[PDB]
């Protein structure tokens, strides 16, 4: 429909998106970071305080 | 047990064939003069 010059009626459009996902979120780990590593074998062991 | 013939043998050796034969076509013209496209799916469309 040429009748008049509008956007409503265009054929095959682009939908034109935005090429970024911006869902940031917070992941800190401070715990984690200071902490260790202390790689073992079994699960079952102690401390003996 | 006389008369010893084919029947009576045993312990034969059969003397089958080393071939399989087979006539289902395989022609298919269409898929071979169409052509494939590409990757993308309907996102796209002719829209003509």
Not at 13 to 34: C, E, Y
């Given at each position: 429909?040429?009748?008049?010059?509008?956007?409503y009626?265009?054929?095959?459009?682009?939908?034109?998106?935005?090429?970024?996902?911006?869902?940031?979120?917070?992941?800190?780990?401070?715990?984690?970071?200071?902490?260790?590593?202390?790689?073992?074998?079994?699960?079952?062991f102690?401390?003996?305080?």
């Amino acid at each position: 429909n040429p009748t008049l010059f509008v956007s409503y009626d265009q054929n095959g459009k682009k939908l034109s998106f935005a090429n970024w996902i911006s869902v940031l979120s917070p992941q800190d780990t401070p715990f984690v970071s200071m902490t260790g590593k202390e790689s073992i074998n079994q699960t079952i062991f102690s401390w003996q305080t």
